[PDB]
Structure formats: C-alpha cells, structure tokens
Write a protein that binds this ligand. Structure first.
Ligand SMILES: C/C(=C\Cc1c(O)c(Cl)c(C)c(C=O)c1O)CC/C=C(\C)[C@H](C)O
Ligand SMILES: C/C(=C\Cc1c(O)c(Cl)c(C)c(C=O)c1O)CC/C=C(\C)[C@H](C)O
Ligand SMILES: [Fe+3]
Ligand SMILES: [Fe+3]
Ligand SMILES: [Fe+3]
Ligand SMILES: [Fe+3]
Ligand SMILES: [O-]
Ligand SMILES: [O-]
Lengths: 266, 265
C-alpha cells in the first residue's frame, strides 16, 4: 500500500510533515510483535540449565550474586508483597534487560561487516529481544513513574552494565549469552511469584486499566487484567531464556557462524 | 505452535544440524519494496549547509571522497567492472556502521531516561541491515584480497569510534554527514548506471546473486543494471531519511515522532 517512491526519494527533507503526524502507540516498535495464547503460556514454568564448565559457572554465580544483593538492598525480602514494590522492581531491572541484545546484535553486525560474512539470522533475533525488553520498560513506566534518586541510579547502572556487557561479549560471547540465560531464569521465577500472589489473593491488583502500549503490542482485548499483562511479559522471558541458552551452547560447540535455529519458527 | 512447551525447554542445540541455510533469513522481514520503472528517476540532490555543523559535515565528506578517489585510483583510466565492485565493496562496509550506532544510542536513551522513542530505532536499525545487504550482495560478485581484507578491518575501528563519540557529542552532525555521504553514493550509483547505458561498461555479473533476489523482490531475468538500480534507491532513502532526522535535531524535534512511520501506515 505505502506511497513511498521516487518523488519522495528526491525530496531534500520531510521536516515539514513532522507537526502533522499522529502519535499512535503501535509506532513505538516494529511489527515483529509476539503472539501469545493466554491459556497456553499460563503453564510456562521454572527451569534451570546446568552449568557446564568454568565460564558457565562464573556466569551463574554472578547472577546469583546480583539477585542476592539486589533482593536485600532493595528490601524486596521482608514486608508483604505489594503492587508498589513489584512494579518499582520490574521498572528498574527492565532498564538493564534491554542492553544485552543491543551489544550482541551490534557486535555481530560489526563482525558481519568486517570479515564480510553472512550472519544467518542472529542479529535480528537479539535486536527484537532488546526492543521487546524496552517495551517492558515502556509498559511499567505507564504504571509507575519514578522519582529523582531511582532515575539517577538507573543512569549509573547503564554506565556500568553497558561497559560490562560490551567488554564481556568481546572476550566471551558465550559468557554473556550464558549470563542472560540465567538472568531470565530469575526473571521467570519473580514473575510466576507475582501471578501466584494474585491467584492466592495476597496481591489483589489495582492497575487493571492495562496501558494502550501493552494492549497493541501483545494484542490484548480490553478486558485484560494485570495478571494477564504479567503472564505475557513472563512468557517473553522464557523465550529469551532458551534463546540465550541455545546461543551460549552453540558457541560452546563452535557453531557461532552457523544458522540461528529460531529462524524456522516464523 | 510456539507455546509453553517450547518455552519450557532448556536448549535447542539438537536442532542446529536439522535447520537449513536460507537466504531469506540473512535479514529481517523489513525489505525494500521498489518498482524498477518508478525508481529509474531517482536523482542527485544537494542540501544547503544550514550552519557551521552542516558545513563541517559536508567538508569532511568532500575531503574523504577526494582523498579516497585519488588514493584508490577511481579516476585513473577507464571504468572497469572490477573497479566499481572493488570500490562499493570497500565503502559498503563503512555504510552499515552509522545506522547501528545511531539505532543503539537512541535505544539506550529510551532505557535510562524511560521515554518513548516514537519510531526512530527501527528505521535506524533496518537502515544498517540494508547497507549490510548491499554488502552481502557485493561479496557474491568479488572476494577481495588479503591487502584489502586488512584495510577493511582497521577502517572499521577508526570509523566506529569516530561515530561513537560523534553521535554522543552531536547527533545532528552525524545524520548530516550520513545525509551527505548518501548524496555522493547516488552520484556513484548513477555514474555506474550511465556507464552501462553507454557501453563504457559491460557488466559480466548480470546474474544477480540469490541473497539479493529475495531481498529486493527481483526476477531471475534482472541484471547488473537493475541491481545497481534497487541499491541506489536505498541510498536515496538514507539520503532523505537522514537529512530529515538532522533537520529535526536542528529544530529540537529529536523527541517528536519519526515522520516516516506514518509514511508507511
Ligand atoms: C534481580 C536479579 C534477578 C531477578 C530478575 C531479573 O534478573 C530480571 Cl532480568 C528481571 C526483569 C526481573 C523482574 O522482576 C527479576 O526479578 C539479578 C540481577 C540483578 C541485577 C542486574 C542488578 C540490578 O544489577
Ligand atoms: C569515497 C567516499 C564517498 C563516496 C561514496 C560513498 O560515500 C558511499 Cl556511502 C558509497 C556507497 C559510494 C559507492 O561506492 C561512494 O562512492 C568517502 C570515503 C570515505 C572513506 C574512505 C572513509 C570511510 O572515511
Ligand atoms: Fe529479561
Ligand atoms: Fe523483560
Ligand atoms: Fe549502501
Ligand atoms: Fe549508503
Ligand atoms: O526482562
Ligand atoms: O552505501
């Protein structure tokens, strides 16, 4: 349908149309949207993949280290589950789930460029993850808008984590792929906790006006609840879990330069 | 069927030897959709340097072009097919960088600041996938030497770092520099198309590589000329897109909606 041709291709700029373009939410992201069936992802579950050698273990310990610090300094531990402390948590952490896929895709892109080789579907998987995790941030920022101290520490988190993920991927892309493997193993846990808590009425949700950003992106009918929004986010994490564990494995076997297995499901 | 059972499995390593190599998976599903007779009237344009930043973005490229042309010997003797492919192979390695760094920085910015990006990221990302497809195409028609393979490696480093700091310091300057580069690229890509029509250049690669035929939706009958003609249209989308984006920065509009995302929908 699109009216994008050579009369538009010879224009100097479209700076002038800018004031008259709607801000329809579906533009926030590409159309590689995930399609989940609520009754099917409902039975998503908690898995754990056994570390194989030193690097796998190094990876696994730092995630157990990070979970333990974060869970204790952020007081998630004692007190009853709350809406406030769930979304505040998911808000902060989602800012750092967006970085990995962008360092991998970006570096694998540069490699594809300098040795002039075919990537075989890897780049477009990691960048849709990154995107899909950024949409996880976008949704929670419709739910809780943070204040100055939480914002400043988000900025320093990215400084540090961008530097770590970047230099960790260059030296061991299996490490970073293992690391998100396990990262997501924890993200699956936390979320099924939130659903279990709703189901056992310990956290009866007040944010049921599910944001338009999330309705379009996950194609949810108006009558969707917070629990239905959470499950889909949790379903996305189970995928990344397998994707980064498959990716790490593939490296272990020296299949870096082989077809991205998840191309078939499309 | 992509459901819980597949999500609840640990690894899909056993599946690697059973999944086949398919040219359609080398990119995303966001492909250029051109019609040959329409895009035949793409044209060389030149934006006016609007101020000290543009003037610098323009004077950088012009000097890069002059230097590269006397150093590569483009102008020395006749146009040959090897001289064109050689050149565009080299240059299309560099071209994939800018959209990536741009795409990356803005991604990052929406995460720390927690703000809508409103369509820039994708456009800037498929823009880098597009140039890389030009590249994957040119690697089919020539497989460069060791001297050139080294020359290509080191040039990534200088260029990557340059754009990294460039985009952090001033994204306006980068998009302009990119806009300007893609003027020059259309000049080359029409010079080539013109050399064909005259018979100063007789291509022998009028068998267009598989990757390129499903990327651009071409026919098995399409030739070298036709391929240069779809690419040129890509280089003119990056020309407009990036000069617009840089006008948006000049006006403090870099957090409005990317206009092109309606110019599709
Ligand atoms: C807290 C951690 C795991 C649990 C976890 C996750 O790993 C992730 Cl990834 C998510 C999204 C959730 C969602 O609620 C989540 O609960 C370990 C990582 C800690 C850091 C990186 C610190 C902050 O630097
Ligand atoms: C010679 C240059 C531009 C002309 C040009 C283009 O800009 C582009 Cl983008 C293309 C595709 C073509 C077509 O082949 C092309 O001929 C600039 C060179 C820059 C460097 C050597 C380093 C990186 O700074
Ligand atoms: Fe995650
Ligand atoms: Fe997430
Ligand atoms: Fe190009
Ligand atoms: Fe280009
Ligand atoms: O996440
Ligand atoms: O290019």
């Amino acid at each position: 349908t699109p009216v994008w041709g050579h009369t538009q291709l010879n224009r100097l700029s479209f700076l002038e149309t800018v004031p008259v373009v709607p801000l329809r939410v579906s533009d926030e992201s590409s159309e590689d949207r995930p399609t989940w069936s609520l009754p099917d992802i409902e039975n998503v579950a908690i898995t754990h993949k056994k570390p194989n050698g030193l690097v796998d273990t190094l990876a696994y310990r730092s995630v157990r280290t990070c979970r333990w610090l974060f869970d204790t300094f952020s007081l998630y531990r004692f007190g009853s589950i709350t809406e406030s402390k769930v979304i505040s948590r998911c808000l902060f952490l989602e800012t750092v789930a967006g970085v990995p896929g962008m360092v991998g895709g970006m570096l694998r892109h540069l490699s594809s460029l300098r040795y002039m080789t075919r990537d075989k579907g890897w780049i477009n998987t990691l960048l849709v993850e990154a995107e899909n995790e950024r949409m996880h941030l976008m949704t929670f920022i419709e739910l809780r808008q943070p204040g100055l101290p939480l914002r400043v520490s988000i900025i320093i988190t990215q400084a540090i984590m961008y530097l770590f993920l970047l230099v960790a991927y260059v030296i061991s892309p299996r490490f970073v792929h293992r690391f998100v493997g396990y990262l997501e193993e924890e993200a699956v846990i936390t979320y099924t906790g939130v659903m279990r808590a709703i189901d056992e009425g310990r956290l009866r949700p007040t944010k049921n006006d599910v944001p338009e950003v999330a309705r379009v992106y996950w194609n949810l009918s108006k009558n969707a609840t917070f629990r239905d929004l959470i499950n889909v986010i949790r379903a996305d994490e189970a995928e990344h879990r397998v994707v980064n564990h498959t990716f790490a494995d593939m490296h272990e076997k020296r299949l870096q330069n082989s077809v991205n297995p998840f191309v078939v499901l499309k």
